[PDB]
Design a protein around this ligand. Structure first.
Ligand SMILES: Cc1cc2nc3c(=O)[nH]c(=O)nc-3n(C[C@H](O)[C@H](O)[C@H](O)CO)c2cc1C
Ligand SMILES: Cc1cc2nc3c(=O)[nH]c(=O)nc-3n(C[C@H](O)[C@H](O)[C@H](O)CO)c2cc1C
Lengths: 97, 97
């Protein structure tokens, strides 16, 4: 089974560059603004990263510069949007089947 | 469970534009050149699409223009690379993970 199908999208609006780690912030749409929280795992078109911080509707995620090259995340650029999907480490209704 | 972690990457090298559907072709690296085939499902950073055709090491995938806007696939541009991952409809030993 695999779908990689994204529930919603995000608008890159600001980049935060830290010589220790790179950070990117997107604009969360109405149906992703309700529910998502910092420390959550957001997959951008299916690449899971964690939310470093939320700037109101915006959300900054963490991205290592070398990981950015290793993945195709480096392709992101502000003014563009992303396919964003909510990911969770554990949940109440895990009981599969 | 979710990782969206990609085994390999692809280089966008040529775009094929059909007024019926949009097509994009990438350059498959050495460890993705062996195994992948047309009609296979490739997830680009986690968005699954099917291989319309292989051009030697290159691989053209299908992408609807409206789906391209609906997803964040439209962000792709030649000269850039993608996080590519192999997906299959069925297998001899999925195992489940
Ligand atoms: C659950 C999970 C979360 C990840 N989060 C990030 C992330 O926030 N930023 C990043 O550059 N890579 C992330 N990765 C990629 C991964 O941790 C690692 O960087 C690559 O496998 C390269 O070693 C994540 C991977 C997993 C499995
Ligand atoms: C298995 C699978 C394969 C898909 N392949 C493509 C594709 O090759 N091109 C595309 O634009 N969308 C693709 N999608 C997206 C999906 O079929 C549909 O276009 C979106 O859900 C919008 O209706 C795929 C979705 C699934 C579940």
């Amino acid at each position: 089974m695999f779908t990689g199908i994204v529930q919603g999208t995000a608008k890159l609006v600001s980049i935060d560059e830290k010589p220790n780690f790179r950070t990117h912030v997107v604009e969360l749409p109405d149906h992703m603004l309700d529910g998502l929280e910092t420390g959550a795992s957001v997959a951008h078109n299916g690449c899971c990263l964690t939310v470093t911080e939320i700037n109101g509707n915006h959300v900054s995620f963490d991205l290592m510069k070398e990981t950015l090259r290793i993945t195709n995340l480096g392709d992101l650029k502000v003014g563009d949007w992303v396919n964003v999907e909510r990911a969770a480490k554990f949940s109440d209704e895990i009981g599969g089947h």
